[PDB]
């Protein structure tokens, strides 16, 4: 059933699994028309499909052309997500196919189940975790490849950079969720924290800066502080 705090270590075991987040698939700007009505303009989106054990990110870029002449786009976006995840699974060799797919939003369960009828042994699961994967588009290199896309494209990343050389998957996931939670709560402040010292850079082949173990502890502290500062505002507590 549902993935929660109780069964959290399951993410880092040797059963291949993917998280699927559909929150950036259908993206719009809302604007006024000449006549003073409101209209939307779609911008490029992405499916965020992540192996939490390895850090392998299957970023399927959703080009605005897929919405052309379609109705009920927020409904279609879930089915298009399920179609592309299904296509990704079929594209993988059998020994690389997930045993479980965890959707971050319960509205993805039926679309994904129906698209995966051919894979009765792949479990489709919700989660009680509130995962900040919506903030993926605050990672500059992921935002840049999505916005520049002129056609549907899949791009492969490792969202953990080289962290697994030094830390476990559990710790890598905890760092990623803290970074994304900070970026989601106060993007400006989080990015300031990540780039304030110009001597620490992002390698061409990486998403995040090349922090030493001690620098990561400092950064992680600064992100926790950011999240608590922000929370003390939201709620006046």
């Amino acid at each position: 059933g549902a993935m929660n705090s109780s069964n959290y270590a399951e993410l880092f075991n040797n059963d291949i699994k993917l998280f699927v987040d559909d929150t950036n698939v259908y993206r719009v700007t809302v604007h006024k028309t000449f006549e003073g009505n409101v209209a939307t303009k779609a911008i490029n989106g992405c499916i965020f499909t992540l192996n939490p054990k390895t850090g392998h990110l299957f970023l399927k870029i959703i080009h605005t052309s897929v919405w052309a002449g379609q109705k009920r786009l927020s409904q279609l976006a879930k089915w298009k997500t399920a179609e592309e995840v299904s296509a990704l699974v079929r594209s993988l060799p059998k020994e690389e196919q997930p045993k479980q797919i965890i959707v971050t939003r319960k509205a993805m369960l039926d679309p994904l189940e129906v698209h995966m009828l051919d894979f009765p042994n792949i479990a489709i699961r919700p989660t009680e975790l509130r995962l900040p994967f919506s903030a993926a588009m605050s990672i500059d290199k992921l935002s840049d490849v999505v916005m520049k896309a002129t056609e549907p494209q899949m791009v492969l990343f490792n969202i953990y950079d080289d962290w697994l050389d030094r830390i476990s998957s559990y710790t890598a996931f905890s760092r990623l969720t803290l970074l994304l939670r900070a970026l989601k709560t106060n993007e400006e402040s989080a990015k300031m924290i990540l780039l304030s010292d110009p001597t620490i850079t992002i390698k061409s082949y990486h998403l995040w800066p090349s922090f030493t173990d001690e620098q990561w502890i400092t950064i992680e502290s600064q992100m926790r502080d950011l999240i608590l500062t922000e929370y003390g505002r939201k709620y006046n507590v």
Binding site: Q75, W79, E83, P111, V114, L117, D118
Partner: protein, 300 residues
């Protein structure tokens, strides 16, 4: 007008005959039911006074043979049997009628209720859902599971309703996932109507049979099947106009007959709310929507 004689009534029992029911006392001189209308299936059903668990009964059609009920003290139930000797049977019935030891099927002349509940129900279709080929009548009870319930365990004692599953490869064409899941017309019209049932009359017959087993026996699997067959039509954007108009009549009579006190266990809130208020056919079931809103406004 046909007769189902009883050898005797050795245990106190509530006897149902279609939508009617009568209490018989232990060793009461009761010898059966006469004036049963020819032209319809019928169901004769039992609930023992000393163990109200296991409602059970027999679907039959008096055109298909001479049937009687005899209590079996070993298996502890009233059994239907066929009498192959016409003249013995005629002589048994004539004697019990002369001694007025039979209840009369109590049909009001104006009253089309049973026809309306069984319009599409055929004994030959019942005998394919309920497999016991040596008998011309069919035993059903409260506890019998469906082929579908048994997949999710004695196959010989199962209700072989047509399996309907909205998240199945049968229901969903490769490449038409969203279309077929949100609009079940493919599944209704091609797979079920053209493919399996051959026509709307067979589909309605099974729907009506499922409802009557749900109502008369509290058969949970039958209730699931009745709701699945309603939902498959209501969830299809493309349904022939005659089928929608006929479904509205079918459901109206079903909702009219349902005991008011069983609405809580016999009606699925989600299915009925979806069918009447959100589905493609939300505005196609005028009679049904009106009786449901007046009789069961709580459920909705």
């Amino acid at each position: 007008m046909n007769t189902v004689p009883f050898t005797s009534a050795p245990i106190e029992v509530t006897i149902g005959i279609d939508q009617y029911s009568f209490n018989v006392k232990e060793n009461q001189p009761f010898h059966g039911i006469k004036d049963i209308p020819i032209g319809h299936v019928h169901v004769i059903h039992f609930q023992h006074a000393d163990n109200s668990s296991m409602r059970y009964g027999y679907w039959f059609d008096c055109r298909m043979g001479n049937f009687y009920i005899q209590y079996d003290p070993k298996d502890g139930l009233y059994k239907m049997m066929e009498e192959r000797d016409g003249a013995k049977f005629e002589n048994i019935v004539h004697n019990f009628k002369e001694r007025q030891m039979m209840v009369s099927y109590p049909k009001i002349d104006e009253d089309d209720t049973w026809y309306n509940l069984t319009e599409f129900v055929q004994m030959d279709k019942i005998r394919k859902i309920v497999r016991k080929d040596e008998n011309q009548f069919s035993y059903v009870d409260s506890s019998m599971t469906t082929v579908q319930e048994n997949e999710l365990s004695d196959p010989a004692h199962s209700l072989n309703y047509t399996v309907i599953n909205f998240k199945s490869r049968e229901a969903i064409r490769p490449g038409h996932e969203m279309e077929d899941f949100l609009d079940k017309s493919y599944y209704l019209n091609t797979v079920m109507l053209q493919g399996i049932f051959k026509n709307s009359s067979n589909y309605f017959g099974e729907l009506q049979f499922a409802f009557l087993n749900a109502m008369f026996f509290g058969n949970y699997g039958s209730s699931l099947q009745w709701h699945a067959m309603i939902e498959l039509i209501c969830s299809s954007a493309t349904v022939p106009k005659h089928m929608l108009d006929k479904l509205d009549e079918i459901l109206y009579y079903q909702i009219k007959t349902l005991p008011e006190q069983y609405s809580d266990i016999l009606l699925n809130e989600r299915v009925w709310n979806i069918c009447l208020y959100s589905s493609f056919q939300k505005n196609s079931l005028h009679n049904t929507e009106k009786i449901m809103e007046n009789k069961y406004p709580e459920l909705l």
